[PDB]
Design a protein around this nucleic acid. Structure first.
Ligand SMILES: [Ca+2]
Ligand SMILES: [Ca+2]
Ligand SMILES: [Ca+2]
Lengths: 226, 226, 225
DNA sequence: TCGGTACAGTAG
DNA sequence: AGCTACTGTACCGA
C-alpha cells in the first residue's frame, strides 16, 4: 500500500490527516477496524449463529457503506481518552526509551477492507496501543494485573493490529494522570498465531457476507468514497 | 367509544391533540399501551411468578396513576423522529399511494385501560407504525432480514395495536433519511389470533392486579385525570 | 472520634455537610455502607472474589493512590439533594422522632470502615432516607415493604449498624411526585448474620488492599497526609 | 423456584 | 477511537 493508492480509491491524501478528523472518519467507513474486530471473532455459546453484537457490527458497517456517514458519539469517558493520549505517548517514550512516530491509518491490503490506526510505531519495530482509562479503577486493574487482566476486546484489537501491519510484537500502555506515582504501565504483547489464524478464517467470511448483503439491496463497497 | 366520552372521563378534547404534546402524554397515564405491552405478556421460563420486567412496568403504570406524571424519556431519539416524521409520512404516501390520517390515541373500550397511539391510519383499513430509527444500523437490520428481523417488542406492539383497534392488518415501516437511496422499507403484518388470545388472557388479569394494588394504597384508576 | 480525625486529615468534622468538599475527602479509600454490598458478595461459582468485589477492590485502591474520586450517578444524587430537607421534615412529622444530621461515622481508629447516615433519630435509631429517582421504585417499596428492599440496601443498612454499634435503623423512601402518601418507611433490626459476615470478611478485604497497595509502594492514609 | 453474579448487548 | 455505564438475559448452586 501507498499514500498514493489511497488517493485513487477515496480522493483523500492520507498524510494531511489527523486521527479524529473528517478525513479520518471517512477513511474508516465500512472498513473492519482493530477496535471493533472483537465483534467479528465473537462466537455463540453454541451453534453456528452469529451472536447479536456481531450482527450489530455487521449491520453498522453495511449502514456506513450505504449512508456514507458515521454517527458522531460523545461522552466524558471518550473525551478523556482523547485528551490525554498525547501525554500518555510522551511519558511512554520517556520511560521505555523508544521513539514513537505517529501513524494515521494502515490498511492491510489493496482491498481496503481491513484497517487499524496505531497509537504509534516504535523505533524498535513494535507498534503501540495507548489507553487512558477514564476510571482510575481500570488503570489500577491493569497496573496490578498486567498481561492477564487485559480484556479480550483489547487483545483482539492488538493482535488484529499485528495481522494488519505484519508486525511481531506490540506495546500495550495505560496512562492515568491522576495517579500521584506509578501512572504509566505497559507490557509487550507477542503476535499470537492462534489469533492470526482465526482472522485469516473469519475476516474473509465477514467480508464475503457483507458483499452478499449489499448486492441484495443494490449497493457496492466503495460507494461510501465515491 | 368516541370523543365526547374522553372529555367526560379525562377533561381532554382529543381533537386539539397531536402526537406527542402535553395532553398526548396525559391520555396515556396509567394506560397499557402498545409500545410497552411486551412487558405485560412476558412469562417466566418455568412457574407463574411475574418476571422482573413485568413487575417493573406494573409499578411504572401504578406510579403514573398516583403521581400523574411520566418522566420525560429518550429526548435524542424523539427529536430525530419528530424532525423526520413528516417526510417519512409524505414518502410512505407517495410510495404506497395510500392516504394517511393521523390518530392521537385509540382506547380499546369504555374502561380505557388499554390503548395504542399509531403513527397513522391508512385509507385502505390498515394502521401505521412508521419509525425513524436513531441508528442507520437498525434501519439496515430490518431492510435485510425483513419480517424475521423485527424487534420481538415490536411484533407485540403491532399485534396489540390490532387487538386494540380490532383491525386485521398493519404497515410496519422504517425511514432513514441518511440512506443515499431506498431509505423507506415497509412490510404488512397480519393479525395473529395466537397474540389476540394472549391478550385476552393476560391483559384482564394485569388490570385486576393493578386494581388491587391501587386499592391497597387508597387510590383509584382515573385519579390521574382528575 | 472527632479528635483523632484531625491527626490524620487536619479536618474539623464540624464544618461538614452531606455532599460538600471536605466530606468527599474523608471517604477516600474508606469502605462505606453505600458500597459494602460489593465486599460481601459471594462468587456465583468457585471461591475466588467475584467481579464486583474486584471492581470495588480496584476502585478504592485508586482512591488511595489518586487522592480523588469521580462523581458517579449525578442525576439521582442531585434529585436526593433537592428533596433532602422535605423528606426529613415529612419523616419527622410522620414518625414523631426528631432527626439530627450526621456526617461520616467511622467504626474505629483504623478509619477503614465508615458510613454516612441520613440521620440519627431521637429514639436511638439511625435513618436511611432515599428519594428514589423513579416513582416506580417508590411504588415497589410502598407495595412490597421490608422484603422488596434490594440486597445492596439491606447490606447498606446492616453495615451502618455494624459501624455505629446500633440495634435498629429506619429505612425510608420519599417521593414528592406522589399526589399523597409519598412517605413510606420501616424499621430494620440489627441482624447478627450480617454482623458476623462483616466481622469475618471486612478485615480480610482490608488486608488484601494493604498488600495490594504495598506492591505499588503506596500506603493507606496517603490520600490525606 | 429463588437469590443472586457475570456478561452480552447497546447507548452515549 | 474514545472507555465507560448502564440494563436486562443467561447461568450457577442452594
Ligand atoms: Ca488507543
Ligand atoms: Ca411510533
Ligand atoms: Ca442516603
Amino acid at each position: 500500500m501507498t499514500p498514493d493508492i489511497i488517493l485513487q480509491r477515496t480522493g483523500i491524501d492520507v498524510r494531511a490527516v489527523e486521527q479524529g478528523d473528517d478525513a479520518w472518519h471517512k477513511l474508516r467507513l465500512g472498513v473492519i477496524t482493530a477496535s471493533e474486530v472483537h465483534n467479528v471473532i465473537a462466537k455463540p455459546r453454541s451453534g453456528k449463529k452469529w451472536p447479536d453484537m456481531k450482527m450489530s457490527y455487521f449491520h453498522t458497517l453495511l449502514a456506513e457503506v450505504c449512508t456514507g456517514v458515521a454517527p458522531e458519539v460523545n461522552a466524558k469517558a471518550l473525551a478523556w481518552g482523547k485528551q490525554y493520549e498525547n501525554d500518555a505517548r510522551t511519558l511512554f517514550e520517556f520511560t521505555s526509551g523508544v521513539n514513537v512516530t505517529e501513524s494515521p491509518i494502515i490498511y492491510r491490503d489493496e482491498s481496503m477492507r481491513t484497517a487499524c490506526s496505531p497509537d504509534g510505531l516504535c523505533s524498535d519495530g513494535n507498534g503501540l496501543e495507548l489507553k487512558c482509562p477514564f476510571t482510575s479503577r481500570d488503570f489500577m486493574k491493569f497496573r496490578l494485573g498486567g498481561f492477564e487482566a487485559i480484556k479480550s476486546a483489547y487483545m483482539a484489537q492488538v493482535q488484529y493490529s499485528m495481522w494488519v501491519t505484519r508486525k511481531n510484537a506490540w506495546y500495550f500502555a495505560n496512562y492515568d494522570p491522576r495517579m500521584k506515582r506509578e501512572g504509566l504501565h505497559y507490557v509487550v504483547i507477542e503476535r499470537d498465531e492462534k489469533y492470526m489464524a482465526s482472522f485469516d478464517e473469519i475476516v474473509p467470511e465477514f467480508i464475503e457476507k457483507m458483499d452478499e448483503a449489499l448486492a441484495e439491496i443494490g449497493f457496492v463497497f466503495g460507494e461510501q468514497w465515491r
